[PDB]
Amino acid sequence: MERFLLNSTVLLYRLSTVSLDEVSLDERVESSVFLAQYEQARSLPDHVAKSAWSYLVQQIKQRNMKLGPVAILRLIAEKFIKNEKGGPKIDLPMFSEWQTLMSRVSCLPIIACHQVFNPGPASQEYSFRWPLYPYHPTVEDYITRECLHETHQHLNGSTSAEECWLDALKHPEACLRDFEKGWASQEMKQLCAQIDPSLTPRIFKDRLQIACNIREILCRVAQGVELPEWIASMQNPQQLANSTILHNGREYGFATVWPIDDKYSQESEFCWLTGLLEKWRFNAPEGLERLLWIYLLIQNQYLTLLVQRDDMTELREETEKSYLSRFKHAHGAGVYSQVRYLEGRFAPKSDPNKMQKLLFSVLRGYWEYLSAHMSMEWVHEKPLTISQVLDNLELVEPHGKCVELALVPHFIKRKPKNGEAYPHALLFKDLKNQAAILMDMLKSEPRLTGWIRGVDAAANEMHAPPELFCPLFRVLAKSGIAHFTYHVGEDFPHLISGIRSIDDALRFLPLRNGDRLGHCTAIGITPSIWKRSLPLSLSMTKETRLLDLVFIWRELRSHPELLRYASDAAIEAVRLAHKVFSLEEEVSITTLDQVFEMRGLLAESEGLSLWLEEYERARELVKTTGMKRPLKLYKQWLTSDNVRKQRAEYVEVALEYLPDEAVVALQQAVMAKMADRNIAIECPPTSNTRISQYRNVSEHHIFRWMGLPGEAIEGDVPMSICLGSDDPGIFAADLKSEFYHLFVVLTRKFGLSPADALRKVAEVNENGRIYRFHDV
Amino acid sequence: MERFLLNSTVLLYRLSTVSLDEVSLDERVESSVFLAQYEQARSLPDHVAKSAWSYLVQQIKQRNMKLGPVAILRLIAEKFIKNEKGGPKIDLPMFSEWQTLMSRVSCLPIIACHQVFNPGPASQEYSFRWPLYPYHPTVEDYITRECLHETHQHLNGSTSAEECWLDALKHPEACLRDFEKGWASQEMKQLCAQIDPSLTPRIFKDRLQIACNIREILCRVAQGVELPEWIASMQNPQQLANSTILHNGREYGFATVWPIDDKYSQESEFCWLTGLLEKWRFNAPEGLERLLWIYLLIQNQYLTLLVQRDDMTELREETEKSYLSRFKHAHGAGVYSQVRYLEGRFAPKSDPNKMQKLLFSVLRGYWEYLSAHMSMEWVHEKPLTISQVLDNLELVEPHGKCVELALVPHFIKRKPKNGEAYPHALLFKDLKNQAAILMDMLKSEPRLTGWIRGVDAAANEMHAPPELFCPLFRVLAKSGIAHFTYHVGEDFPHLISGIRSIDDALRFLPLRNGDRLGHCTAIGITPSIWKRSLPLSLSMTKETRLLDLVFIWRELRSHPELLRYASDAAIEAVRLAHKVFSLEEEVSITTLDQVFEMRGLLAESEGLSLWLEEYERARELVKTTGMKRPLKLYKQWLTSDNVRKQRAEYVEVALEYLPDEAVVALQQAVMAKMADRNIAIECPPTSNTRISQYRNVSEHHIFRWMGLPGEAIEGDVPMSICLGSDDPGIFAADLKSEFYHLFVVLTRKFGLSPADALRKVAEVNENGRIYRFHDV
Amino acid sequence: IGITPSIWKRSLPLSLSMTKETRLLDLVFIWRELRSHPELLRYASDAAIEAVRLAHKVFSLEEEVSITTLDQVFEMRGLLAESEGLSLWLEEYERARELVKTTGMKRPLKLYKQWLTSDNVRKQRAEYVEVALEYLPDEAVVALQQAVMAKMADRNIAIECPPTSNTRISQYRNVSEHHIFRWMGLPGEAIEGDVPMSICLGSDDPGIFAADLKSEFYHLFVVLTRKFGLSPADALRKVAEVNENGRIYRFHDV
């Protein structure tokens, strides 16, 4: 019930619109908790929620406290945080629930409450920058010996959501413009309405202003200075939405003086809350206590909005400082970095000048991190340019006590616009342009090949198929990129479609030995779990259905137990192809296979500088053999309006079109291809629950990949799995947190020994070192 | 997506507040569908919903239709309803999905659309009164041979929700007063807010008035008469909330003339919709099409509100007509009744005059049903009183071709008020009073014992424990009731608590051979399913925790594999009893058991006409033995304010306090006691999903009770299970529908032969005849 | 928890002497661990019954005391004596005092007060009783050892093993009989049901004139390779695991 109190749109609305004169809101807060509980967790029974609320109220009453943010934070701090040899830690049994709580509530008020009421031993100096972790001697010993390796680290944005919230307070206008820019899209409107139906940019401005004003008022309370007496006119919380209070006809401001020069820093945020909670140890004024409650609710709702949206001026506000903070966060506390190999992902920019500034800022921040930790001779104390930064960076030797940085830009796929010859034309031109700036820069600075180590494509799978990036990747390979990773968007209309998508990526993309694929959930999730809460029939496009049909026939045409399914797939695929192509001749399943074999060829090459050489190479390889009828069919597949109209048409496919054994066989066939090609998998953090079929962390497919008994299916081919913390789905997270989360689940729910659990997690962690993109 | 279009608060709000001049609302309806889908079914992935909506829009476009109620009803009718030998039926594979749809959408518009666009063979006469059923020759043959038996039929209210909706239109004021009377309670406010946050009695009045006005306007359209030209002033749907339209300064009414004298009857409802859909076969006006959409949305939301709320003037509006319709509905179509033994449940009234009128109306309606179907000599053609009704009814012989009626009033438990000596004093006095009128009537008409065959208690389990009704049942037994059934409310804070509740009912209640218990889900649901979507720790009162602790020790003190759990339960129960009783002596677990053995004794008897004889009988049985220390402890348990305060206090209990094997052992121990005492179980309909842990019908615990492989657990003791359709949870339902639903699930999901599936369902059905309360 | 009952009984009298305090505490411990063991319900029931009878003598009380009440009194042993009778030291004082008064029982608290501050109770506690050597069979004692093994592993507490060259045990007639090899999981040495534990190398009192941690490392390797017939790689792996437990469970600041 604590998470509902600290995160509820209904409670925030009922607290931000009601005047502070009222003091007895227990009934209405209770109603808010029940409404939030039903909205967020409907599967929870009503009587269980009522009993939990009754226990919570009794617990507060027995502690001589009052229902509010202070009491709730105190109960959470005792429930989760205790003091150990390394400072404040999280109980190993309680870490899984803590991660679930971190998806809804920010931890900074909780740790501040813990410091106030349960201080560390001997009053030793303590600083809260990194998220809290549990402690196990085996895990700490392994981390100190073998540092953690990150394969997917988005360098854009901030390390966590909480300092993003402070950034929003620091620059309300910049975040407001970004919010409105996203809000114009319909997806953001739906997402905001899901979180809060009564959410508008006007209300967003009001809530941001109210939270900032509450911060200033409570800063005066926490600092110890007396209130400036305009609080008498302060009766309604909505008066803080305009950044000025009218008292006796005078316009009074809200900002005050802060001891730290950075009033929006993490340390200022922690110090303010610790002081405010210390002064409210025994009692608090009701109006100001509600003000703290409103601030926490506004902050938590903003953090939820940010994390769900994640998966110019604002960028220039931090620039190299954000990257420097990222590398310090990856380093962690102590002289020795907890992370050795870190692969940074950044969004490519079509502007060459913006690109040069972007990589200069990232590389300069990396040099700043190295110079702060390592004291050595530098060629340029103030490089101010990429060339001098590389001059300083080339003096650094691989020693393992610091973070080793590899840069992998991730191309962003977009929606396929109507017409425009082949379906993905404008998107391909944009990606080709972005590659062009990347290539001309690499030839303009050959030393950048030692830092620009890979190319990624992570937007979504429906918008662009894997065969789109094949000419892009092949031409980029000749530019010295030397590594390629492709994100398989796991929003497949059918499980077979996702398995086909991974197979298509292996078939067409030029993934060499040691390459990686991103988020291969389709071959990881079992059919039984995937079918949870799904309609008995599923909808997908004719193009996707036809491709899945050919894939099913190819994999299963020999399986004696599954010759039903392959023969049926081949027959009905031929019948579907007759509708899609509108052809009148006879087409066998073999001919359909050949047409889909040449999918990787460029559209212009199919119709027929590094780019041109790839053009005739694909063109000649389509003409060496004596068949042009499949080539003609592929031309009709690409550049026929009737075919495109048929392709975009949706068909109705049953949920259990193939039995679970058949789908598992397809997954294992792709497993064999994945292992034979030696391609690693960047597993998402297990705390990220966008799958929506996993009702607990123990049901995650990584444990099936780990070969756990009960989880692994007979016939599964072992694969290389890496740890990638790109979108953790929780406010405060780290690669260490994911490492501990996997260890905790293995030890507790699966009942593994600490050594055995460490061995399995270490194997996954070391796969990020074996399959790293860093230059050797 | 069809269910979201026909049932969505967001869509209804966006359609009832926007003027009819707008014609292109496809984008905003699409947004409404996504918001409703996320709110109702969040576990469904976003991309799946988008693909389904795209297919639905394409399906409508390819049919040359327009997005609206007409097209949606057409698609549903073809998707579910087809014509067979018995008329319009439901596909056997599609019946499970149809039942799920019936929980959200009324079927009457769907069947009307089916009749319009897919008429029956040879244009044969067809009447829609009963809900649609699937057809299987084995099931029909069994029903004709062995009629269905109902053990739980609430005679109050109407047969289904749909004619309740027409009753609301018939008497808007009566339903408005009932709605406001419920709305004063906080539970109704929470329930209405969950269904619709912006729902108030003022809005409820507006929506009822709008729906009635839409019905009148579309009645003129369906009848063929031209609109009376005030539609020009009709631009905004909210103008129908005041039952009068201002056109050119004149107050024009909405009511029109209907061909049938009963404008609010089912036949009038069906005929109106069939005519309106027939006149809109090819095209419909946009404004009136939206009006039909708004009417369907309002009706569906009201039906959802009614079914969730279910589990004076309005009663007098129907009176004996409702009971007569109930018996005709139970009889079904054909000369021979599909139901033979029907046990009617009615709410007892504290007013003797109201009670006499209530039973007179029910019995007279039963005589009307018998006289309509059977032509024979009657002593009184117009009895007008109970005595003459029984004079007519005693001439009817048991022949099996008609419905045999047994009356079982169900006592309603209430909240325990504070203080008042023993915890349940005012409730016990109210129940004792209600029993008093029942008893004096039975002695005033001894022939009523052949119709008043049982006594029930079905409100909830937390509000009143089973031991409350023990003096009530024992005294009622001496009055000639001869049967007793007790409803075990399945909102237990813990699974052990529910198992203890069933055990307490068997231990204390005077359930003789052939008696039944209602809704024994606690011993039916497996621990694995029950733990779904539950917090790691659960909250319950100290009284409930202590009783569960003693129960665990009693059952498991000998189990060699479970001597951990019994010894731990006994030790910590003794420690808990020290806190609750605040005693300073030494209390063993045996002494605690003895104190809880005497729970069934009356509170006044514990402190120490048919009622008095029970008083000294319990008093003397507590004094025959030489122990009064457990008696003294029970006195402190009943009449000590400190003990009551401790009892109402809540404790924190882990979810996995006992392993699944231990909980299953407790369930099987109660299974053995249930079978040894030969007590049947009235199973709820499987279409009623208030369990919230069952994500599909195949996961229901009735199949575990049926002994199905995979579902039944080793060591389970077979029990007698009866079919009781009290709260089906769907708008249109019947005992036949539940029979078909069980047969469909057994044949399809469990892969049983039609003969084998029929045998299992027949065994459950015939248990309602073996354990019937009817006089032999 | 390392030495097997068979080796420990070597060269011991058929009956052993211990104080009434120690005997009573062992009796409660036996009942707590074995009250569920179906093969050992003799020993737990006998321990509980005779513990209650012993407590009657020690406390000289006349009321009825169950084994559960005795358990509660010995649960509060960790509380401070002054706190039981009722700066960093004071905060611990009321913390133990309040935790003894949150619950509604003071009769076990009163019994613990008599256990601490009653001259008759102390005189009874210092009195010695006669206990047979084979009071519990080797299976029962091994079960107690494995129960503590499970608690040791669940709490993740390491064991600082003494050097094997230190023969103050007096029941080990050769180094190959040392209990560290049972902890190492060696065949023949490890008993069925043993819970693996973390064992560290600690050279505090080697028992020989010239010794080192290297000498103990070589001694374990030599015994594993020769007397137990293990491969040099296998023997090194087992000794390395024990050696690296001193790094995983080290007290040094990280």
Query: Is the Cβ pair C105, B582 closer than 8 Å?
Result: no
Would you call C101 helix, strand, or coil by DSSP?
Answer: coil
What is the distance between the alpha carbons of residues B597 and B741, in angstroms, rounded to a whole number? 42
Q: Which of A522, A488, A461, A457 is nearest to A691 (CA)?
A: A522
Write the DSSP assignment of A669-711 as a string of letters: HHHHHHHHTT-EEEEPPTT---SSS-SSGGG-THHHHTT-TTT
On chain C, the residues whose CB falls within 8 A of the CB of A754 are 156
Contacts of B44 in chain A (CB under 8 A): 533-535, 692
Residue of C nearest to B585 (CA): C107
Please give the residue of chain B at the shortest CA–CA distance from C110. Answer: B584
b/e B96-111 (16+ beta carbons within 10 angstroms → b): bbbbbbbbbbbbbbbb
Between CA A12 and CA A637 the distance in angstroms is: 54
d(CA B613, CA B622): 15
User: A726: which 2 tokens?
Assistant: 């790109």
Method of determination is: cryo-EM
Write the Ramachandran bin of A408: left for phi over 0, alpha for psi from -120 to 50, otherwise beta: beta
Nearest CB among B46, B55, B533 relative to A41 is that of: B533
The residues on B that touch C, with CB distances below 8 Å, are 560, 563-564, 567, 570-571, 574-575, 578-579, 582, 584-586, 588
Cβ contact (<8 Å) for A138 and C196?
no
Which residues from chain A sit within 8 angstroms of residue C247, using beta carbons? Answer: 141
Inter-chain contact C248–A137, Cβ cutoff 8 Å?
yes
Residue B537 CA to residue B543 CA, distance in Å, equals 18
* In the block, residue with structure tokens 């972005």: A434
User: What residues contact A596, with CB distance under 8 A and at least 6 apart?
Assistant: A547, A550
Please say whether the beta carbons of A49 and B204 come within 8 A: no
Do the beta carbons of residue B143 and residue B106 sit within 8 Å? no
Q: Is A429 exposed, middle or buried (0-12, 13-18, 19+ CB in 10 A)?
A: exposed
| Size of chain B in residues | 776
Distance CA A188, CA A196 (A): 12
Q: Which residues lie closer than 8 Å to B299 by C-beta, 6 or more apart?
A: B106, B165, B211
Rounded Cα distance, A480 and A420, in Å: 32
DSSP-assigned beta bridge partners for residue A407: A344, A452
How would you list the strands of the sheet with A516-518, edge to edge? A485-487, A516-518, A680-683, A721-723
C-beta of residue B705 within 8 angstroms of C-beta of residue B526: no
Alpha helices in A511-562 (DSSP H): 527-530, 542-556
Minimum CA–CA partner of C252 in chain A: A85
Considering all CA atoms of chain B, what is the largest pairwise distance in Å, rounded to the nearest integer?
A: 92
Contacts of A399 (CB under 8 A, 6+ apart): none
Distance from CA of A194 to the nearest CA of B (A): 7
Chain centroid to Cα B45, Å, comes to 31
**Secondary structure (3-state) at C60:** coil
Distance CA A721, CA A716 (A): 14
Which chain C residues are closer than 8 Å to B582 by Cβ? 104
CB contacts of C248 in chain A (<8 Å) are 137-138, 141
Q: Which chains touch C (3 or more CB pairs under 8 A)?
A: A, B
Q: What chain C residue is nearest to B577 in terms of C-alpha separation?
A: C104
Give CA angle at A551 (A546, A556), nearest 5°. 130
The residues, any chain, with a CB within 8 Å of residue B422's CB and separated by 6 or more, are B428, B603, B638, B639
What span, in angstroms and rounded, lies between the C-alpha atoms of C89 and C73? 24
Chains that touch B (3 or more CB pairs under 8 A): A, C
User: Among candidates C173, C184, C166, which has minimal Cα distance to C221?
Assistant: C184
| Tokens representing residue C184 in the block | 């190492």
Nearest to C64 among B560, B578, B586 (CB): B586
A630 φ/ψ angles, rounded to the nearest 5 degrees: -60, -35
Alpha-carbon gap: C235 to the closest alpha carbon of chain A (Å): 19
Min Cα–Cα distance to chain A from C100, Å: 17
- Token digits of residue A445: 């600075």
Q: With beta carbons less than 8 A apart as the criterion, state whether C235 and C224 touch.
A: yes
B-chain residues within 8 Å CB-CB of C71? 571
C69 → closest Cβ in B570, B579, B586: B586
Torsion of CA B84, B85, B88, B90, to 10 degrees: -60
Residues of B in contact with C33 (CB under 8 A): none
Subunit contact C106:B584, Cβ cutoff 8 A: yes
Enumerate the residues of chain B whose CB falls inside 8 A of the CB of residue C105: 575, 578-579, 584
Resolution in A: 2.6
Q: Closest Cα to residue B271, out of B124, B160, B159, B108?
A: B108
Selecting from C36, C68, C71 the residue whose C-beta is nearest the C-beta of B564 gives C36
**Cα C156 vs. chain centroid, distance in angstroms?**
16
Single-letter amino acid code for the residue at A650 = Y
Cβ-in-10-Å burial (0-12, 13-18, 19+) of C245 comes to: buried
Q: Is the Cβ–Cβ distance between A528 and A496 less than 8 Å? A: no
Tell me which chain A residues have a C-beta less than 8 angstroms from the C-beta of B32: none
Strand segments (E) across A480-576: 485-487, 516-518, 537-541
Question: What is the nearest CA distance from C39 to chain B, expressed in angstroms?
Answer: 9
| CB of B94 closer than 8 Å to CB of B79 | yes
HEC profile of A209-271: HHHHHHHHHHHHHHHCCCCCCHHHCCCCHHHHHHCCEEECCEEECCCCCCCCCCCCCHHHHHH
Q: Hey, is A766 helix, strand or coil?
A: helix
* Inter-residue contact A137 to A98 (CB < 8 Å): no
Q: What are the backbone dihedrals phi and psi of residue A347, each rounded to the nearest 5 degrees, phi first?
A: -80, 120
Cβ contact (<8 Å) for A650 and B54? yes
User: C-alpha A600: how far from its chain's center?
Assistant: 29
Record: contact B563-C107, CB cut-off 8 A: no
Determine the Cα–Cα distance for residues B473 and B476; give it in Å rounded to an integer: 5
The count of other CB atoms within 10 Å of the CB of residue C9 is: 15
Residue in this structure with the two tokens 């790689």, named with its chain if needed:
C233
Looking at the partner chain, which of A136, A138, A140 has a beta carbon nearest the beta carbon of C254?
A: A140
Q: Which two tokens stand for residue B185?
A: 């309670």
What is the number of other CB atoms lying within 10 angstroms of the CB of residue C103?
A: 14
- Cα–Cα distance list, B64 to B29, B58, B70, B281, C64 (Å): 19, 10, 12, 11, 90
Shortest Cα distance from A139 to chain C (angstroms)? 9
CA distance B286 to B66: 9
Give the separation between CA C145 and CA A228, rounded to whole angstroms: 69
Q: Strand pairing of A410-411 and A456-457? A: parallel
A251 bridge partner residues:
A246
* Cβ-Cβ contacts under 8 Å, A136 against chain C: 156
Closest among A541, A465, A527 to A496, alpha carbons compared: A527
Structure-block tokens of residue A417: 């616009």
- Number of Cα atoms under 13 Å in the Cβ half of residue C16: 15
User: Which residues in chain B are contacts of A536 at CB distance < 8 A?
Assistant: 97
Report the residue from C156, C196, C247 with minimal CB separation from A141. Answer: C247
The whole-angstrom separation of Cα A434 and Cα A600 is: 20
Is B491 in Cβ contact with A194 (below 8 Å)?
A: no
Distance from CA of B312 to the nearest CA of A (A): 30
Residue B393, min C-alpha distance to chain A (Å) = 45
> b/e string for B661-696 if b means 16 or more Cβ within 10 A?
ebbbbbbbbbbebbeeeebbbbbbbbbbbebebbbe
For B420-473, the DSSP string reads SSSSSSHHHHHHHHHHHHHHHHHHH-GGGGGTB--BEE-S-TTTS-GGGGHHHH
Task: Report residue C7 as tokens.
Answer: 């080796």
User: Helix crossing, C20-34 with C138-154: angle to 10°?
Assistant: 80
CA-based nearest residue to C240, from C217, C206, C211, C213: C217
Q: What are phi and psi of B43, to 5 degrees?
A: -65, -20
Question: How many other CB atoms are found less than 10 A from the CB of residue B257?
Answer: 9
| Tokens encoding B316 | 């007098």
Q: How far apart are CA A412 and CA B352, in angstroms?
A: 77
In this structure, what DSSP letter does residue C19 have?
E
Q: What is the dihedral of CA A278, A283, A285, A290, to 10 degrees?
A: 80
DSSP-derived secondary structure for B163-184: HHHHHHHH-HHHHHHHHHHHHT
Going by C-alpha positions, the residue among B290, B224, B204 that lies closest to residue B32 is: B290
In sequence order, what E strands does B549-677 have? 650-654
CA atoms of B556 and B548, how far apart (whole Å): 12
∠ CA A336-A337-A339, nearest 5°, is 150
Q: In 3D, which of A459, A473, A456, A455 has the Cα closest to residue A509?
A: A473
Q: If you count DSSP H runs as helices and E runs as strands, how many of each does chain A have, helices first? A: 33, 15
Which of B340, B322, B453, B345 has the alpha carbon at shortest distance from B403?
Answer: B340
For A246, B504, B564, the CA distances from B659, given in Å and listed in that order, are 63, 22, 11
**Gap between the Cα atoms of B374 and B335, Å rounded:** 10
Give the chain C residue nearest B582 (alpha carbons): C104
Taking residue A328's Cβ as centre, other Cβ atoms within 10 Å add up to 20
The token pair at B59 is 């399906």
Q: How far apart are CA B467 and CA B465, in angstroms?
A: 5
Q: Distance between CA A548 and CA A573 in Å, rounded?
A: 9
| Cβ <8 Å between A86 and C254 | yes
Query: Residue A135 and residue A494: Cα distance in Å, rounded?
Result: 41
Q: Which amino acid is located at A492 in the chain?
A: F
> Which residue has 């740790």 as its token pair?
A111
Q: Which of C105, C106, C110 to mutate to test the interface with B (most CBs of B within 10 A)?
A: C105
Nearest CA in chain A to B689: A43
Query: What is the C-alpha to C-alpha distance for residues A612 and A605, in angstroms, rounded to an integer?
Result: 10
Q: Which residues of B touch A189 (CB under 8 A)?
A: 31
What span, in angstroms and rounded, lies between the C-alpha atoms of C30 and C49? 11
Nearest to C36 among B563, B578, B579 (CB): B563
The two tokens of residue B246 are 């201002």
Which amino acid is present at A688? N
Q: Residues A704, A723: contact at Cβ < 8 Å?
A: no
Radius of gyration of chain A (CA): 28
Cβ-Cβ contacts under 8 Å, A76 against chain B: none
- C-alpha B135/C-alpha B750 separation (Å) is 19
Report the residue from C35, C38, C66 with minimal CB separation from B586: C66
Q: If you search the block for the tokens 């692969």, which residue do you land on?
A: A343
- Sheet containing A404-407: give its strands across: A148-154, A339-345, A404-407
